[PDB]
């Protein structure tokens, strides 16, 4: 998630893993899925 000049950008990537510990060693990339012209002058967040 980025938020630059009102345009808030969301990249992502959904990928199969088999580990229960933490982020797995390897490489893959995240492709832009949404931009929004939100124009909100932002600071923080919280997950649901």
């Amino acid at each position: 998630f980025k938020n630059i000049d009102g345009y808030f950008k969301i990249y992502s990537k959904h990928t199969p893993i088999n580990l229960v510990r933490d982020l797995p060693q390897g490489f893959s990339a995240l492709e832009p899925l949404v931009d929004l012209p939100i124009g909100i002058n932002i600071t923080r967040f919280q997950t649901l």
């Binding site: 000049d5 009102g6 124009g39 002058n41």
Partner: peptide, 26 residues
């Protein structure tokens, strides 16, 4: 683009105090 709206808007309901930012609070 801008034009003269005296004959369309003039009659006290147009207030005023990062680029492209709107600050609505007061």
């Amino acid at each position: 683009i801008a034009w003269n709206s005296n004959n369309l808007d003039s009659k006290y309901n147009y207030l005023y105090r990062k680029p492209f930012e709107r600050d609505i609070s007061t």
